[PDB]
């Protein structure tokens, strides 16, 4: 089943090329991954940590940083931004 992103998540996915209004979780994760790489939000010395405190992604997820190794927490954060 497709999901519908809330307006701010949708803005972020659109900034990396997404064109739809509805997505699979696989597509949201992909785009979110592209976004973090493009804006260089990961620590280049400690790659599993994403520092989003001064970025839109911080506003979206409500956290200053997060770990890519904490899979359950990433999905929780994404889910709050889906209808």
């Amino acid at each position: 089943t497709l999901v519908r992103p809330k307006p701010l998540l949708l803005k972020l996915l659109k900034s990396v090329g997404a064109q739809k209004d509805t997505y699979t979780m696989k597509e949201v994760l992909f785009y979110l991954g592209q976004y973090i790489m493009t804006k260089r939000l990961y620590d280049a010395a400690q790659q599993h940590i994403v520092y989003c405190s001064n970025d839109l992604l911080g506003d979206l997820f409500g956290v200053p940083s997060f770990s890519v190794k904490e899979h359950r927490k990433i999905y929780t954060m994404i889910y709050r931004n889906l209808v």
């Binding site: 979780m25 973090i36 790489m37 790659q47 994403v50 890519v68 899979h71």
Partner: peptide, 11 residues
């Protein structure tokens, strides 16, 4: 451990 590799392990 690279971001790209590690992110691909989410699903």
């Amino acid at each position: 451990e690279t971001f790209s590799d590690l992110w691909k392990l989410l699903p």
